[PDB]
Amino acid sequence: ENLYFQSMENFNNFYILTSKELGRGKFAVVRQCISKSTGQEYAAKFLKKRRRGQDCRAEILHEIAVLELAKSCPRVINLHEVYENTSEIILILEYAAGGEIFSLCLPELAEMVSENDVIRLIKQILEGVYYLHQNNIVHLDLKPQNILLSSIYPLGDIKIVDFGMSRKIMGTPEYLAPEILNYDPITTATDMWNIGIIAYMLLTHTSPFVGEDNQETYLNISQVNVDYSEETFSSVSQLATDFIQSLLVKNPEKRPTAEICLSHSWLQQWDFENLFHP
Numbered sequence: 001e002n003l004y005f006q007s008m009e010n011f012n013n014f015y016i017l018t019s020k021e022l023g024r025g026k027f028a029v030v031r032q033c034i035s036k037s038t039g040q041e042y043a044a045k046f047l048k049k050r051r052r053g054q055d056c057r058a059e060i061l062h063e064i065a066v067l068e069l070a071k072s073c074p075r076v077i078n079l080h081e082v083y084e085n086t087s088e089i090i091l092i093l094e095y096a097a098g099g100e101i102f103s104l105c106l107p108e109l110a111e112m113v114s115e116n117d118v119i120r121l122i123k124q125i126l127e128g129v130y131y132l133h134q135n136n137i138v139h140l141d142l143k144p145q146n147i148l149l150s151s152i153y154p155l156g157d158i159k160i161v162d163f164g165m166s167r168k169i170m171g172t173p174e175y176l177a178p179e180i181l182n183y184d185p186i187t188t189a190t191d192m193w194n195i196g197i198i199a200y201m202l203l204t205h206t207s208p209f210v211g212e213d214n215q216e217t218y219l220n221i222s223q224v225n226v227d228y229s230e231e232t233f234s235s236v237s238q239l240a241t242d243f244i245q246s247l248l249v250k251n252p253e254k255r256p257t258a259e260i261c262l263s264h265s266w267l268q269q270w271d272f273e274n275l276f277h278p
């Protein structure tokens, strides 16, 4: 195989990797790097071309294309450069220093996340997903581990990441929409199901569908058995609840679009610093 992207020699000439490993999966590792010229931080995502027997460069070219297509959306992580060596294609990506919104869903870090912030984070997530769906891209992997923050002290803006599952219109079980369990075709509605889960997790600090075992998880999804008890929802507003209950519905056709969701009353808010005109 001949290499397409810039050489590894250039990569090591222009960047230095740091000791902060940001993530590791079976065929991918992300590490922070720093430009030697400007000192600006990036995330270098190293993706193996060969997986489970399969030459996967084409699939990697597809993900690069999708990131490029979404370059103008500030809600989607920016792709700055690409390099390649014998086994890896390396993505130089915008650094999101706030880490994952999943961190804000753990009972640990949850007396520091107001209602205003959840409303704003969900609004931003919907703007990015609207932009993607307008372009016929369904993300298909919008777990809270895949939405980053530009900062957390203070709370910054959301960056959607990991387009490896992206398509035109069997992962972590608890985040799988029911239509995926039933093999139905890909729909924009699947991302909307996942937006329901993120709202549910930011607001309750619990997983809506996880069970003791995968078997129970799958039954929870296919039956849409979600806890909406007063214990879990005593400090969650009705409008937020309405938002979630409209997205977490079995029939994908009955879920509202991103567009309709952006007009939801839960998210209509006046910034009190501004002068309102009646």
Ligand SMILES: Cc1cnc(Nc2ccc(CC#N)cc2)nc1Nc1cc(C2CC2)[nH]n1
Residues within 6 Å of the ligand: 022, 023, 030, 042, 043, 045, 077, 093, 094, 095, 096, 097, 098, 099, 100, 145, 146, 148, 161, 162
């Ligand atoms: C501080 C930080 C903490 N945690 C993660 N988590 C994470 C989640 C999903 C993926 C999956 C992917 N890609 C990779 C890492 N990313 C961070 N910074 C990043 C990460 C990035 C780009 C996305 C890698 N920029 N800044």
Ligand SMILES: [Cl-]
Residues within 6 Å of the ligand: 045, 077, 093, 161, 162, 163
């Ligand atoms: Cl990514």
